[PDB]
Amino acid sequence: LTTAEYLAYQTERHVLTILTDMSSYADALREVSAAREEVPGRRGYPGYMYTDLSTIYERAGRVEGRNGSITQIPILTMPNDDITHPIPDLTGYITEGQIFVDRQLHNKGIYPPINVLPSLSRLMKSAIGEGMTRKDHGDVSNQLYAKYAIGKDAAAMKAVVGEEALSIEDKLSLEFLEKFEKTFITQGAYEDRTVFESLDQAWSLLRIYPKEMLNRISPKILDEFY
Amino acid sequence: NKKAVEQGFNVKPRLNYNTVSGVNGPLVILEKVKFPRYNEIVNLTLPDGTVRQGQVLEIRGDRAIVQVFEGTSGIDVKKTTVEFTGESLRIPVSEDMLGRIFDGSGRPIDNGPKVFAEDYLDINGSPINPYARIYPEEMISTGVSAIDTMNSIARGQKIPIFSASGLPHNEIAAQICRQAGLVRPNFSIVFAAMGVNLETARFFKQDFEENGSLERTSLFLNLANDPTIERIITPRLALTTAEYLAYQTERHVLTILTDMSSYADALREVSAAREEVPGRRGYPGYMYTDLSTIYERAGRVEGRNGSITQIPILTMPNDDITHPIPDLTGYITEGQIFVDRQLHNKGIYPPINVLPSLSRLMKSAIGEGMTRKDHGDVSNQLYAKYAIGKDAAAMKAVVGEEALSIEDKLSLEFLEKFEKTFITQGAYEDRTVFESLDQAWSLLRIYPKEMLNRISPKILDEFY
Amino acid sequence: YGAIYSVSGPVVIAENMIGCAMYELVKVGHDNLVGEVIRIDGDKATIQVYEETAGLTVGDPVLRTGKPLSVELGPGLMETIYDGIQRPLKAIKEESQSIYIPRGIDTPALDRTIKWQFTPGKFQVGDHISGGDIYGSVFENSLISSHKILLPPRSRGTITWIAPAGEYTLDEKILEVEFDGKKSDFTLYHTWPVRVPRPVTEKLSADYPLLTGQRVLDALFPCVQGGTTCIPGAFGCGKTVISQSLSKYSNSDAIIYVGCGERGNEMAEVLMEFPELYTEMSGTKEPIMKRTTLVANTSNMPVAAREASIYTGITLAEYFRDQGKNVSMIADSSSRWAEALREISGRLGEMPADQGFPAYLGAKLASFYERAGKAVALGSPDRTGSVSIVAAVSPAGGDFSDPVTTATLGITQVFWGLDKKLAQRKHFPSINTSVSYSKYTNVLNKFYDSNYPEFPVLRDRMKEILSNAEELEQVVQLVGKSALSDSDKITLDVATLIKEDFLQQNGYSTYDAFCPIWKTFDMMRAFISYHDEAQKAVANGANWSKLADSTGDVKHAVSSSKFFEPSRGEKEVHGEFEKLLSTMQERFAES
Amino acid sequence: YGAIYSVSGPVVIAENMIGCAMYELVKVGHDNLVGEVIRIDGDKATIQVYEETAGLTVGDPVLRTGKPLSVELGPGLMETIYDGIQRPLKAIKEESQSIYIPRGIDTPALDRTIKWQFTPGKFQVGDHISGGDIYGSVFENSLISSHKILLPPRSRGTITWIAPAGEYTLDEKILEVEFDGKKSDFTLYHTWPVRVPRPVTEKLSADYPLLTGQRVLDALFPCVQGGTTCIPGAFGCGKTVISQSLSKYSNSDAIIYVGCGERGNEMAEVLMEFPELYTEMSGTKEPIMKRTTLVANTSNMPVAAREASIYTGITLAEYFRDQGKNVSMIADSSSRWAEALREISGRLGEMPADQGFPAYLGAKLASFYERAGKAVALGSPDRTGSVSIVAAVSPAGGDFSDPVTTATLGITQVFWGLDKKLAQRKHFPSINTSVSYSKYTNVLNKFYDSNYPEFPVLRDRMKEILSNAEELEQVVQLVGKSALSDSDKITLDVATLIKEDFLQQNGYSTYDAFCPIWKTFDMMRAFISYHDEAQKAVANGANWSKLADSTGDVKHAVSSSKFFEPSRGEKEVHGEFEKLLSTMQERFAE
Amino acid sequence: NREQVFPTRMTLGLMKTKLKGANQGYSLLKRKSEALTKRFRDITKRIDD
Amino acid sequence: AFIILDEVIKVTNRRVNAIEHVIIPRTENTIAYINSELDELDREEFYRLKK
Numbered sequence A: 001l002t003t004a005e006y007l008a009y010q011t012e013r014h015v016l017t018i019l020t021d022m023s024s025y026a027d028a029l030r031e032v033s034a035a036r037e038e039v040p041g042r043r044g045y046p047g048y049m050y051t052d053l054s055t056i057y058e059r060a061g062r063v064e065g066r067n068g069s070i071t072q073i074p075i076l077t078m079p080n081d082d083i084t085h086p087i088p089d090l091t092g093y094i095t096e097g098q099i100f101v102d103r104q105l106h107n108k109g110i111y112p113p114i115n116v117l118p119s120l121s122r123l124m125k126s127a128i129g130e131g132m133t134r135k136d137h138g139d140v141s142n143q144l145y146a147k148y149a150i151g152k153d154a155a156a157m158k159a160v161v162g163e164e165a166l167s168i169e170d171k172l173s174l175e176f177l178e179k180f181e182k183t184f185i186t187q188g189a190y191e192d193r194t195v196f197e198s199l200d201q202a203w204s205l206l207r208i209y210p211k212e213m214l215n216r217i218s219p220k221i222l223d224e225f226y
Numbered sequence B: 001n002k003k004a005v006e007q008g009f010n011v012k013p014r015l016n017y018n019t020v021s022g023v024n025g026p027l028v029i030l031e032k033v034k035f036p037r038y039n040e041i042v043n044l045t046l047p048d049g050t051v052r053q054g055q056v057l058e059i060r061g062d063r064a065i066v067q068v069f070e071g072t073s074g075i076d077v078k079k080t081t082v083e084f085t086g087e088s089l090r091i092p093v094s095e096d097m098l099g100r101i102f103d104g105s106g107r108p109i110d111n112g113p114k115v116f117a118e119d120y121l122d123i124n125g126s127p128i129n130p131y132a133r134i135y136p137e138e139m140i141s142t143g144v145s146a147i148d149t150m151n152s153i154a155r156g157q158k159i160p161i162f163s164a165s166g167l168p169h170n171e172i173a174a175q176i177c178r179q180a181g182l183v184r185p186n187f188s189i190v191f192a193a194m195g196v197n198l199e200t201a202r203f204f205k206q207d208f209e210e211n212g213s214l215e216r217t218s219l220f221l222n223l224a225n226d227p228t229i230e231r232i233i234t235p236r237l238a239l240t241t242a243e244y245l246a247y248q249t250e251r252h253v254l255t256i257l258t259d260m261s262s263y264a265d266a267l268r269e270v271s272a273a274r275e276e277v278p279g280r281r282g283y284p285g286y287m288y289t290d291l292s293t294i295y296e297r298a299g300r301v302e303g304r305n306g307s308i309t310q311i312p313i314l315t316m317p318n319d320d321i322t323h324p325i326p327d328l329t330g331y332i333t334e335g336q337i338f339v340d341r342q343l344h345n346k347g348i349y350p351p352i353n354v355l356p357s358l359s360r361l362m363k364s365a366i367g368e369g370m371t372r373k374d375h376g377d378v379s380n381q382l383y384a385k386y387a388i389g390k391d392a393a394a395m396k397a398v399v400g401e402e403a404l405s406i407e408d409k410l411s412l413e414f415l416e417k418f419e420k421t422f423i424t425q426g427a428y429e430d431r432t433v434f435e436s437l438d439q440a441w442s443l444l445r446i447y448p449k450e451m452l453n454r455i456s457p458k459i460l461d462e463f464y
Numbered sequence C: 001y002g003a004i005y006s007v008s009g010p011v012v013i014a015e016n017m018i019g020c021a022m023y024e025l026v027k028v029g030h031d032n033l034v035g036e037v038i039r040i041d042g043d044k045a046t047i048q049v050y051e052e053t054a055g056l057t058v059g060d061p062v063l064r065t066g067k068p069l070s071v072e073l074g075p076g077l078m079e080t081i082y083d084g085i086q087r088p089l090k091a092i093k094e095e096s097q098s099i100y101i102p103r104g105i106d107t108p109a110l111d112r113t114i115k116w117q118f119t120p121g122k123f124q125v126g127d128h129i130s131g132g133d134i135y136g137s138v139f140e141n142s143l144i145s146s147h148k149i150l151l152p153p154r155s156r157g158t159i160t161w162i163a164p165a166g167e168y169t170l171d172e173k174i175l176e177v178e179f180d181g182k183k184s185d186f187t188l189y190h191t192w193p194v195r196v197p198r199p200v201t202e203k204l205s206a207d208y209p210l211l212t213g214q215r216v217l218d219a220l221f222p223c224v225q226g227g228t229t230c231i232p233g234a235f236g237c238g239k240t241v242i243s244q245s246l247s248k249y250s251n252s253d254a255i256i257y258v259g260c261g262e263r264g265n266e267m268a269e270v271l272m273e274f275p276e277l278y279t280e281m282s283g284t285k286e287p288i289m290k291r292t293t294l295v296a297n298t299s300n301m302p303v304a305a306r307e308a309s310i311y312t313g314i315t316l317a318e319y320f321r322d323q324g325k326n327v328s329m330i331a332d333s334s335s336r337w338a339e340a341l342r343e344i345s346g347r348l349g350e351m352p353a354d355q356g357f358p359a360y361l362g363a364k365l366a367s368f369y370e371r372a373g374k375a376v377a378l379g380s381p382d383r384t385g386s387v388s389i390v391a392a393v394s395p396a397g398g399d400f401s402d403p404v405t406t407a408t409l410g411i412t413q414v415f416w417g418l419d420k421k422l423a424q425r426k427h428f429p430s431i432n433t434s435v436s437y438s439k440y441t442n443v444l445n446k447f448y449d450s451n452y453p454e455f456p457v458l459r460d461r462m463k464e465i466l467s468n469a470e471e472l473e474q475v476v477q478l479v480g481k482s483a484l485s486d487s488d489k490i491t492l493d494v495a496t497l498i499k500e501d502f503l504q505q506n507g508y509s510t511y512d513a514f515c516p517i518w519k520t521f522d523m524m525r526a527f528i529s530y531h532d533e534a535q536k537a538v539a540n541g542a543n544w545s546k547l548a549d550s551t552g553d554v555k556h557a558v559s560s561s562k563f564f565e566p567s568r569g570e571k572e573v574h575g576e577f578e579k580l581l582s583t584m585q586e587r588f589a590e591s
Numbered sequence D: 001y002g003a004i005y006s007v008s009g010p011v012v013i014a015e016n017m018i019g020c021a022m023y024e025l026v027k028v029g030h031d032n033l034v035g036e037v038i039r040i041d042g043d044k045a046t047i048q049v050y051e052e053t054a055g056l057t058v059g060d061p062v063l064r065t066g067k068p069l070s071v072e073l074g075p076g077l078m079e080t081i082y083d084g085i086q087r088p089l090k091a092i093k094e095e096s097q098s099i100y101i102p103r104g105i106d107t108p109a110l111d112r113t114i115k116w117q118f119t120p121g122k123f124q125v126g127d128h129i130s131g132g133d134i135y136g137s138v139f140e141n142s143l144i145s146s147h148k149i150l151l152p153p154r155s156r157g158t159i160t161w162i163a164p165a166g167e168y169t170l171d172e173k174i175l176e177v178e179f180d181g182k183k184s185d186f187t188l189y190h191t192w193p194v195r196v197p198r199p200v201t202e203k204l205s206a207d208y209p210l211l212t213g214q215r216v217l218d219a220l221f222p223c224v225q226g227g228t229t230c231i232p233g234a235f236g237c238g239k240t241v242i243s244q245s246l247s248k249y250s251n252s253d254a255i256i257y258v259g260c261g262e263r264g265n266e267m268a269e270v271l272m273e274f275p276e277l278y279t280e281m282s283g284t285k286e287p288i289m290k291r292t293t294l295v296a297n298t299s300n301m302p303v304a305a306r307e308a309s310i311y312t313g314i315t316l317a318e319y320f321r322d323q324g325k326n327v328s329m330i331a332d333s334s335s336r337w338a339e340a341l342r343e344i345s346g347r348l349g350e351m352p353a354d355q356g357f358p359a360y361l362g363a364k365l366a367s368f369y370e371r372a373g374k375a376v377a378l379g380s381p382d383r384t385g386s387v388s389i390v391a392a393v394s395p396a397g398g399d400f401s402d403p404v405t406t407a408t409l410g411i412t413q414v415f416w417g418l419d420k421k422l423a424q425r426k427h428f429p430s431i432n433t434s435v436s437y438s439k440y441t442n443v444l445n446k447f448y449d450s451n452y453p454e455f456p457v458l459r460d461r462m463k464e465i466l467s468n469a470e471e472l473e474q475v476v477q478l479v480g481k482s483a484l485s486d487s488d489k490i491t492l493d494v495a496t497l498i499k500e501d502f503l504q505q506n507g508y509s510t511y512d513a514f515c516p517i518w519k520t521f522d523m524m525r526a527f528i529s530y531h532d533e534a535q536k537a538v539a540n541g542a543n544w545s546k547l548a549d550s551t552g553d554v555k556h557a558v559s560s561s562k563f564f565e566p567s568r569g570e571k572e573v574h575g576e577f578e579k580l581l582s583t584m585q586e587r588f589a590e
Numbered sequence E: 001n002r003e004q005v006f007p008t009r010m011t012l013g014l015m016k017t018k019l020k021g022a023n024q025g026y027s028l029l030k031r032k033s034e035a036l037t038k039r040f041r042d043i044t045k046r047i048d049d
Numbered sequence F: 001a002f003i004i005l006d007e008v009i010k011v012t013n014r015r016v017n018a019i020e021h022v023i024i025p026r027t028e029n030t031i032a033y034i035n036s037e038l039d040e041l042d043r044e045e046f047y048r049l050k051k
């Protein structure tokens, strides 16, 4: 990260720091802390693990005088696919978002197995839409998230209390979830989907629903794009 | 001839320490010790004249932490004199033990004389050399169909009985002792009671008397009112007696370690008294090591005609096999016999659930020569069809009997006629392995020859 | 020579011991118990003694050996059994005339009375020789022939003198190296510290598969020669018989069977069975025991010696990798190694971390599994050995949430998750197809395209069938099997067929003891073709119930494909499977 | 006397305590607060003060009593009310004239101001005397006369002086025993370590039944004199009825009741109800308090007292057993005793094992329950006594989640399974016979073959009838009621009659207040005879509706079996049952 | 025999809520089945007539 | 109406049995396992704090 800070602030480059196994780094912290017989946090990790992880993660962003940036994507191994674990928790706290890779999706064979429900990006609302990418980006993303959540909940309800409980909207959400995991999320490596192409595919996914049932889409965008 | 006893004629005076620095819990921190041994068993004398034995667990510089088996109540720092024996805990073993009753600490409660020691062996023993081991390939026909056909006990096996508080685990192990015999031609049982109640101890003693076994059994009774710390050493004493008998006197010893759940409870209490790791469910992190030092004393060795077969009776705290005691015992031992409450409430005796049970020494001791050639295939097919019966029973309870297929209905019929006829025996009915295999083949003949997919074609053609 | 100060279980703090290094080996007590320094608090040096500690008094001497725990490498180990500290158990028994392990016995790791037939290598007098260079070969046994005598790593220089061909023991000099004017004398053996991995020129991406012999392991979740593996599961799941059936029937040129916290009866079974087993490698039927050395640490042996057993076994595997043999080290329980580490840590008073396992457990496990890998040996001539670590984790309670299981899953590449539900009902191997994975599936595509091109497609189809049937069964257990379509009926039926005939492989029957790759491939072809034929015939319009009643003959022929003995040969078995497919299409065509 | 060194909460460290013993009671402070010694480190000894430790300075004297937590055993125990520490609540109230218990109140646990009649035993001057030997007798009460004075179990030696017959207090000497010197002198009372069980020569197997007086508890799930039972003990279930029954109608010649942490308003209920009890005897009606000792112990009490309440109660029961008397020790709120034990363990800092409970909870419970049982008492004469423990398992009634509940159900052999649903449904004594069990029927088979031979067979028959009734009720819930066969309908009707008349006992009612064992056996025989006659009539092919119409008179006659008052007793009521049994056959035959 | 859910304080509460909801659904569905079965016997009698 | 009501009763009873024999037992077992794991974590935290 000090190499990245150099390259990005003193040489004005755009850096993409790809720290991997921050879980391994925090395990090293726990080993160091355990040798010092300090007061531990959750699961034995040092109480100052939030401070150390903040010191590492907060070394990303753009400064005024400089024309360079540090984009940080710290790969992180959830020890048991648990967000509640201290390492993923505190990281969520410091970082501004996450890309949640799902073991269930990987078992289903979806690549990339990104589960979009726990995934988040705090800077989407600023970097997306209003001429930055396209007028429909934010509304389409909101509608996709809403329909994916409805599909997951309705699939659970159909598995538990049968298909009778699921209404027409719930059946449509199940079909959308199938066609969404299978055709939208699924993307082989080396395949560059431009944001515009991805938005067109997302609209094709959203056309499964009637115009009325699309809730989060603004009326103007819905009329202009459906 | 025997030069080991030549060193016996030696007197070793013992230092009497009045320097009890402190006492806390089951431990006494005793200072000013002259070269403390790590595992010396000391004779601690209370001010009231009572003598409690204790063994040092940790030794700093001129300081030994003694844990006393009877407990530290009444111990004082001014008056309690501690007499270091200078050696680890050694049980006086002899062939005269067979037929006697001993307390939890090895003292005789049989109202007879103290053991005329033939040798003094350390209770902790030593690990048997794996190169010196012999794999137990001699099957025991315990007379129980569930334990002889489904599972199979070879002679030096460690095969516990996993049960709950109210199940007839004592009755089943008593049935095994009174019926155990080599399948293709006597056992000198050694019984270890740890924390059991007087009813259980009297039941086992009277069962041995009735079957005529007491002439060749040594009983180590540590009742529920006996000190809890000595539940640790009771199985060590019983297993050291068993090791002596078997490996030196050339005897075949059954070892019944009743309430290894109580042994593990005493172990957890002692561990929690100290500042030790909690492992799982509070049990010490070394509970695997301790239970292994207990269990793995069984087996057969090369060059000696003796063997030790262990049947540690284990009480499952909540009828779950994922509890630390049953899990670690299953990891260590070479199988388990699973007594089921779901069958005991159904009225079956013995209420042995076959699916959770296991015998790691069935591959060996099952074959064309040791037993009938069909034994392994029949056992595997019975396991498969019993599981299909359980699944069919669950599916029947869910979606009614009509939705079940022909195979599912056949499997439910097999389940009924298996639990009610194969598993079920009288308390004193011993079934030869061939008898139980004939019954098993009838239960398989319930099925068509095509559905018996576990049986090898030659066996199926020669036995169906 | 220090003195013992504090003794508490396996740890022994020794006073008056200034100058002791970390992880050095000390001879604690009068019996010279092997120990290892863990801490140095001033003059105190906490020592984990690798033997039973009972009987140690305060003031007992503690000799400083000056060298770390060093496993003694050389010709001799091939067919031996060791005690974690590399004490030959056979020699211990012969020397002590007892059935127990004596405390502090100091038998040599490699037998010195045996005379070895040394044949000099390409290196001559004056040739510069570096670490790992093969300066000679010795015939060990009929199976491990030309046991290459490697120059010790970290040792370099010019050959001043090399012994000619003849018969030598391990004590005799074999070669003399002059480096910086200091002559160094080399023998048939050399000691290497277990903690430091043996160096290699360059580790490579493993491409050739480690053929386990089990159908499910070979097909669904393969492991490459040089890949870290993991077999979590409860007791009775079969993680020891999988290890044994992988040490018997794999294509590995050598086996390092390590037992940490295992029953002594298991190692006794290995000793009784491996000599009676034979392998077709080297062009002759040589006993398996001629290529497998055992590191036996029974579960009641000293706790601290389990780490020593793990490290000794992995260093033996690395040595044979350096010789160039595709070795696979089989740790019986990394879980019991972790439990030993936890016991030592708790005795030390260290901070509990997760479940009491010390916070460095994940790091130590990661390092031990990183010892594996296909690698080009350090010295010339060029050779590419491999160490395929397949360690059977044993999580407490049969739950894969244990810290040791999670760390092992993080570090390894193949996860052979065992389900106790399938361990019961005698469905072995009990591999849980849902949770199990193998990350070498993609890298094995080269081998599969070379040998069995359709094998990955068939395994993908089998995985799809099994997953579809799992979903359909989850549906059926709640909503009954009546609402299913005929295609769903076919899926469930063929998946039950797969689980009951193909995936399940009895490891003690003559036919399915070792199911080789060609028989496994033919069996996958049979099952997938049966499923495809049923699907096509029902799509044509046939009712599935009547179709199954008619084609029960073909279904039973497929279900009886297990019994085709691999001993009949590759050609004879393939001929029987070719006729099976022909007899399958005709019967489905007729109905 | 030592001195205080450090006080941080109830734990107190006392410097200058050389010669102090572990688990020894000491008098802490100038108010003489009583506390046990937890651990010793050289001179300093760690003390848990039982009362509140506020106001304890440094240097306050710490006297050493020299004995562990002891129990005052002797005459004057019977009618008194105690706590876990065994401090007389009545005497404390009379001494302090206040509704509170002052800190460090030292009223003797046995009344030293009462003159006790004493009659010397067979042991004369010069005769050897050992532990437990009855060397005298004391007339204490009407129900419990001849309070047999025992030599302390540890004491031994040769008699030198014995007190002549007369009136004595507990303070003044009674016996002088010489053992290598006259180091022993004995009064009417003696002290026993509470944790240490009182020794016996031999602990027999409990064979005789404990007739609680209730038909269900005495027939379906019997207990043996010396057996350990288990009761859910939840509120609104009839545990009060069970306690009163065991107090006044049981075979036990003495009762020890321990609260060990029950609520205050509850303690008020029991302390106001038991003195109002009256057990009819051969002479006349006299209070059941004349034979019952109440160890009253509320939540406000010290946690050490709450943890030692059951131990004091079982030690009192062991003492009364050592006199050859059969004792029933009703342990209310064993779960609250376990909660007190957990609180003490947490205070000491010991690691938890299961649900926060200490690692030794199971061992402590097992030892406590093993302290029960029939046993021939120590010392001559060869009298035999028994202690039976009835333990209210948990306010969390029968919940296997609680480690204390699991341990109690695993150790005790009889579980009487009260049901709140049946209590709401006006079922008394609210026993849920489906979950209730007894493991003492196998050992009681001997007594039944000796006295009432058919009893095990008829009990098993009724258990089978109840199981078949549950199955038939499930069938009639699943499908139509008329779908059941004639045999199923007969089984359901007979079981309904059994529940309405035999099982349902009106304790408050005068006729069925106390059903004797012979009356229960006769009613059970009559019910089984009626069921067998109905089954035979069904096998004959007769319509069940017509059979019921014809045998309504027999049904009323057998239902009147409850209304037959056992006041006449023995053959007077047994002869009536013979006519009722005969009428159940002649009418059925016609 | 149990759901493969990662243990958590929030997860325990969510699963207790799920158990309460399942019990409520089971009771209401049993009531619905009983009412519909009563109507079913009525309809069968009407069909016979 | 009879046929439709029979189908609805069949599916309703199937759902009732499915709940009472799978959903309730699985959820109860999950509750027990989660509570046991939370107790284990609390015990680990207690032991760490005791150290």
Ligand SMILES: Nc1ncnc2c1ncn2[C@@H]1O[C@H](COP(=O)(O)OP(=O)(O)O)[C@@H](O)[C@H]1O
Pocket (backbone or CB within 6 Å): B358, B359, B360, B361, B362, B363, C233, C234, C235, C236, C237, C238, C239, C240, C241, C242, C428, C429, C505, C506, C507, C508
């Ligand atoms: N593939 C298999 N073929 C035949 N038997 C098996 C197989 N897997 C397991 N078993 C049976 O299960 C028993 C226990 O398996 P084991 O190897 O001990 O697993 P673990 O070490 O995990 O308990 C063995 O004795 C064996 O009889």
Ligand SMILES: [Mg+2]
Pocket (backbone or CB within 6 Å): C239, C240, C262
């Ligand atoms: Mg194993």
